[PDB]
Design a protein around this nucleic acid. Structure first.
Lengths: 150, 80, 123, 129
RNA sequence: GCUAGUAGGUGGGGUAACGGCUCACCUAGGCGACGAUCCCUAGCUGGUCUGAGAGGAUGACCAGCCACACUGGAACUGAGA
RNA sequence: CCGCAGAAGAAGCACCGGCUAACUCCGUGCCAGCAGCCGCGGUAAUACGGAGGGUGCAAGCGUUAAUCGGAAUUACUGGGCGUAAAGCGCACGCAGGCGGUUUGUUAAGUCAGAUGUGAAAUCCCCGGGCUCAACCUGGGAACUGCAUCUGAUACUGGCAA
RNA sequence: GGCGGCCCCCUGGACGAAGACUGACGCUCAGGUGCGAAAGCGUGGGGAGCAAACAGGAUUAGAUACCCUGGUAGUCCACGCCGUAAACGAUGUCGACUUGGAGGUUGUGCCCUUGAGGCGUGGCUUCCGGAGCUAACGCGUUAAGUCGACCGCCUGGGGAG
């Protein structure tokens, strides 16, 4: 009962010699209801085929986000060129008011409580490529204990 | 209950008066450094012993003539 | 791709371009119609649309349009002024709202409802 | 580093604890082995050694978990001449309530958390977490 | 680029009370680039059209100031103009 | 309020692209017209201009003179300096900002509080009283500073060495 | 910036050192103090060889021209108001930074100096090494990742130099 969504595409079609040339791309995400989320990209000759090549790529294992229980405990660095980025937790009862430009990165696993919209760039490819690499760099509730003792 | 200012001996003209002008210690809400702007400490001197190089302590008394209220106490800092 | 060539005419069709010169106070006004003009040969075949000038301390002279229907828009009248330069017209920079005073405009045109202010037909 | 006494502590330890080292060494100073005393109690380090008691030095044992710094998110805000002072009710509350920061008040250096429990105000040395 | 009773002493005075607040005299002293001259355009404040808010902005609810009510400058009379 | 007497006696504006929102049947030739960012009309004009249906909301609908919105911006409280704009070939000294760093030391600023101010409509929260929404209010509160003092010693400034 | 012959005098900066003696006399700067590539003003001239201008014959769709002999100024400049542009780490003051090794170089401690430099060490320069940082070219500790004292400059189109 896994979860599957897209977020972006290019109009990618140009003048050449010569008439017109065309191509077809995607950027997609997947998730498991036990706090697991993932992403990737595809290309094809056909549009619903550039979605499939993407979503088969997003199915790679899906990172377990530190979610205890309806919210999360630390804003991980989504480091990028100038995006910046930092999420803002909310106190376990109020909803996923985050950037619909990328929100499917947190929505596909069910996560009820987190916000922040897209603080330094209104291009999804930028706040996507940033978010997933902060989510792999995280720490469990159990790790931060060791980080501050033994 | 005297206010005791830190007066540097900076000017003399008259026989039984001097001016010991330092910075005005009544602050306002500004940047984050000291209150560095002067005030006109006319002192009724009588003994001249603080001369030229000292730091005096001064106290609140009657302006018997134009703005010259203060009187002397002692040497806070010795002649240089 | 070459900006001092591109900037003029790319792709938009409402466009910004307008030129709206002077200010001195506000652009709306009362408009002493100062003198009435009926002339100036052009390719837009501009009959009956009798523009006027306006004595306003602005630094240079200024002129204003008939706004809409109503033949007797007379040069002694002092109806109201607003901005909006229709592409039909050189020299002008504002159009009237000409319904006050003795001016009429809207004689019997039932469709005006709130647009200019009219009462209902035999409904 | 004499333009900003004691800042070269926090900089040198964040380079230190990224640079794959178990260790980072310097001379001691009026407030730095104080900061070391908090970190060993807050266990964000393994240990420190005050070495050479007649005129000592300052040696910290860095917590090289995963080969990334335990302090990678730190921020030294307060700076020379232009201090930053905050009441008992203004004091930091950081990462949604997980904590921590380090302050200076009338009872030493301590954390935000320790300064709150005391009922104190003070200088804002570093948001740690 | 600014000081004239202005700046300091001298002493007369007299203010409910400070003083170049000021007469007269001995005398040239006061300030300035750690803003001395001189002015822009402003009613100001608790409050708030708008609240993470930090800024854009408004004096005009109630008074609190004025300041008047013809242009008024002013003394009289009245505890109180 | 209680009996009779009738659904009686009470509703419309923007309109209708796409913006939060529902569309065709046609007209006139960038005619005449909206002109806010857009977008529209160059003989098949979705809102221009006539009409037919229904829509957004119901004493309410469009819209206006402007300024900030969203948008982040004169930033002690909030910053970019390869970029818009962006370390200005060049530094004799005169004022200025930063002056080494620790012991013995101080408490003026730093902080904690004692007591006072901010009588009354707050903003923030609860409890009511009119039939009651309003409205009319009662209660609790929180007002960086300022005063006048009991403390506490890590910073800001110092004194001694 | 800016010369190249070697040298008389005045002898910029050096800056490698046994030491000696006082204790921050210290950093870094606006308006200023000087210097100041291209250029005007020059006042009298020093007046090669080339070549903008100067003079022509030529190849001419008009050459208002390049040649090609002739051709000055520029060559430099005693003296001196010189702002100044293209002198971009698109970028100043710098202290710690001690996984580092790899060259170009250079004053130099130590060797049976058997040696084409072996054991080393500071400087003036470059090669290009992690954890981070992280668009794509990748940049990877003195460097943009932390961290700091301002003397700035940074007010968006067109207003403009």
């Amino acid at each position: 009962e896994l979860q599957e969504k897209l977020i972006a595409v290019n109009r990618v079609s140009k003048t050449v010699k010569g008439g017109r040339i065309f191509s077809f791309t995607a950027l997609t995400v997947v998730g498991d209801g036990n706090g697991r989320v993932g992403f990737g990209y595809g290309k094809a000759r056909e549009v619903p085929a550039a979605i499939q090549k993407a979503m088969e790529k997003a199915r790679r294992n899906m990172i377990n986000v530190a979610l205890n229980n309806g919210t999360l405990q630390h804003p991980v660095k989504g480091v990028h060129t100038g995006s910046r980025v930092f999420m803002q937790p909310a106190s376990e009862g109020t909803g996923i008011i985050a950037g619909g430009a990328m929100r499917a990165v947190l929505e596909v696993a069910g996560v009820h409580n987190v916000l922040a919209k897209a603080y330094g760039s209104t291009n999804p490819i930028n706040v996507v490529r940033a978010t997933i690499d902060g989510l792999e760099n995280m720490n469990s509730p159990e790790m931060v204990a060791a980080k501050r003792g033994k | 209950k005297i206010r005791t200012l830190q007066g540097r001996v900076v000017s003399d003209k008259m026989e039984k008066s001097i001016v010991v002008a330092i910075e005005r210690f009544v602050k306002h809400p500004i940047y984050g450094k000291f209150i560095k702007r002067t005030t006109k400490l006319h002192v009724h001197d009588e003994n001249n012993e603080c001369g030229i190089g000292d730091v005096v302590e001064i106290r609140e008394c009657r302006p018997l003539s134009k703005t010259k209220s203060w009187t002397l106490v002692r040497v806070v800092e010795k002649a240089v | 791709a070459t900006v001092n060539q591109l900037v003029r005419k790319p792709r938009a069709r409402k466009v910004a371009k307008s030129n709206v010169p002077a200010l001195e106070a506000c652009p709306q006004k009362r408009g002493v119609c100062t003198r009435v003009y009926t002339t100036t040969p052009k390719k837009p075949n501009s009959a009956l649309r009798k523009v006027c000038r306006v004595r306003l301390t602005n630094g240079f002279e200024v002129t204003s349009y008939i706004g809409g229907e109503g033949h007797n828009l007379q040069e002694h009248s002092v109806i109201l002024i607003r901005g909006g330069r229709v592409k039909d017209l050189p020299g002008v920079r504002y159009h009237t709202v000409r319904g006050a005073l003795d001016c009429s405009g809207v004689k019997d045109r039932k469709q005006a409802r709130s647009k200019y202010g009219v009462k209902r037909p035999k409904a | 580093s004499m333009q900003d006494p004691i800042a070269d502590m926090l900089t040198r330890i964040r380079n230190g604890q990224a640079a794959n080292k178990a260790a980072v060494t310097m001379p001691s100073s009026k407030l730095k082995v104080a900061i070391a005393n908090v970190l060993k109690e807050e266990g964000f380090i393994e240990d420190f050694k005050v070495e050479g008691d007649t005129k000592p030095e300052l040696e910290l044992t860095l917590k090289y978990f995963q080969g990334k710094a335990v302090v990678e998110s730190i921020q030294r805000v307060s700076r020379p001449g232009l201090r930053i002072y905050k009441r008992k009710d203004e004091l930091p509350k950081v990462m949604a309530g997980l904590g921590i920061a380090v302050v200076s008040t009338s009872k030493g250096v301590m954390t935000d958390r320790a300064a709150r429990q005391a009922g104190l105000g003070g200088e804002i040395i570093c948001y740690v977490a």
